[PDB]
């Protein structure tokens, strides 16, 4: 791959597109003011799905020279426009009229199917150019570093709204068609082609004015303007936040957020015209959830952050796309946390991007964040959950290492320097290094140019009133000690806190050595020491036995912040699974979480204990670990109770469902008895139970029920009114324990009553229900492999079916059985999932064989 010759660079695009609806085509003429930087006889542009009618170049004050040479290269999406004579150095005007297609590929200038408040089914002209689809709406230099200004014009019917990046400056009628009106927009600033936007359709709107004076609007489908009210007030507060943080005003005169029906791209940060899918921007009061207002605040703060970082200053090449999305993925939580501190959104960030990035970065076949991108198709291949989640995680670690003071100063220097220009990743490290005086380029190179993350071991010794800390770093791997003689090293900024001040740093350090000693002044032995305050650093911490015991009071009295309790517990399970520490040591810490009120912490607690419970189901003391789970969740269960208390939040309803389902599955007698009261009153029409208690009650009564209970659930499903009620049953049907009922659920998955896209959910619940239910699900998909393969081959479902079925196995002999099965019955699209699952089975197998009897003897001694 090679970029455009750059012998002719654009200056201003004058576009006028007439979307031919019903015919699904469009015609448009382009007057591109350009500069000939080097004498050439041909101009090379990007173009796809567009046939040029005629094209001529008119130099300044001269006659136009029509092009008599056309060359369409579809594999490279580039077109060469040859001319009879050399164009010579100077300024000219490239005039190109052409015709295009409103394709069905949800890319470029395509058609968007929407339904009126009555029906009829109409189509709209919606745009989407990122990454390289602007060349399908009009021929252009479709590269982010080739910036120019845009004069957008649209010839739309009178009864249809035409939006674009800028505001409307003229609305004159169309002479050839009385039913059409040409809408001309203002001139955009210097920007990239992949951020240009224009949409044609029928939309209602709600408007407001931000404190900066910027006109904010939320465009909704016809008849849903009230649903975009919340997104409007969030966007109206988001602009002043980024204005104050960047010390740079909003670069455009107006901001628009339009909700589109079935918007495939999800969300696009088009400069001034941010597009969403209505299921992610609007809040339907009779269909939305509880945390929907939280999800809207995040998606609005993310794309509006790009209006500065990404649109005002754009990446030089797609190699730096991770930094554009990683920065926005981090500052979106900073914006929501400032406007809505009642969310404690940073605890959910650690539970989302942070932990998910540490899972992938600790396994084999990982890759560094920044990878050189040659062809723009290589993007879709080498960027994944690693480049974005770990990308946002290292930015958070960098912000904490810099400090919010110098970080704001460096970003203002960065934005003002490269405004309406382009920059690379190294340009950002320089602007931050100038404002902070810290070696940012050197530190960040260890986190971007190599894969993996370090494990920080810390040991404590009391020296007078101070405490000496001995730190060492090594590459962390989910399997254990990293085998390899390269010995990776990281420059690790570490924030340390003590019990005397658990919410602010006791000491900030930078570990640029494999081993390092640290002295904390005035730290009494009765005080605990916590590394990685706020879990801001992208690393795992292994505490010594003495240091871990000192942290137990901090967990119990909640003085340790919830985000710290989340990260501490998550590190303990990973270290025990890797064989670095014992599992018994982790189980003793679980007893200190009995006072935990935070939903996110319990969510990760329940997830980790669920992995261990299903792992220990292969042993002869599965009753002992269930009794242990009941003791951990009993106090929080009694605190929440069964009915919503006066003035609860939305997380307390979610936490009640998680806790009750955990106790119900573990056999908690009081929970099982009450769940049967609610279920028998729900099926007899005496009092329908809440939708929040519905899933835990179903799981509990079905696991501890019989064939009568299963028939009731099947009657609730075949009679279920909506699809949502069906899915809530399909996930819990696998909780049955009797073998003939398990086979009945598996057969029910492939029946006509279950839709094929939901069949994997039913079989997934069977594999996760019990040990014999997992073996029955694995045998079921082997006997019916011909049908299941024909159903989901080459799709996402076949990888999800294999994942949910075999990941729970804890026998190393079983890992060799799934690898041998897919060597005789190939599944090409799921080749990567089989390798991850086989490595995961061997990991759980070694973990089980190493710690089985130690856990057993711990549970017996604890009970006495
Ligand atoms: Zn983004």
Numbering used by the authors: 51 to 914
Structure paper excerpt:
Most of the cytosolic aminopeptidase activity in the mammalian brain and likely other tissues is attributable to puromycin sensitive aminopeptidase (PSA). PSA was first identified based on its metabolism of opioid peptides, and it has been implicated in cell cycle control development of cell polarity, and processing of peptides released by the proteosome as well as being identified as a target for cancer therapies. PSA performs the important function of degrading polyglutamine peptides released by proteasomes, and loss of PSA activity results in increased aggregation and toxicity of polyglutamine expanded Huntingtin exon 1 in cultured cells and muscle. Overall, the enzyme adopts a V-shaped architecture with four domains characteristic of the M1 family aminopeptidases, but it is in a less compact conformation compared to most M1 enzymes of known structure.
We report the crystal structure of PSA at 2.3 Ǻ. The N-terminal arm of PSA can be further divided into 3 distinct regions: N-terminal domain (domain I, residues 51–253; residues 1–50 not ordered in the crystal structure), catalytic domain (domain II, residues 254–503), and linker domain (domain III, residues 504–594). As in other metallopeptidases, the two histidine residues (His352 and His356) of the motif coordinate the zinc ion, and the glutamate residue (Glu353) hydrogen bonds to a water molecule that is also coordinated to the metal. In addition, another glutamate residue (Glu375) present in α6 acts as a fourth zinc-coordinating group. In the crystal structure, the coordination distances to the zinc ion are: E375, 1.96 Å; H352, 2.12 Å; H356, 2.11 Å; and the coordinating solvent, 2.03 Å. The more open conformation of PSA, with domains II and IV separated by a wide channel, results in a larger and more accessible active site region. Notably, average atomic thermal factors are higher in PSA domain I and the second HEAT repeat of domain IV. Since the largest difference between the open PSA conformation and the closed conformation of other M1 aminopeptidase structures is a shift of the domain IV second HEAT repeat, the increased thermal factors in that PSA domain may reflect a true increase of dynamics or flexibility of this region relative to the remainder of the molecule. Thus, the active site channel of PSA resembles a blind canyon with the catalytic machinery located near its closed end.
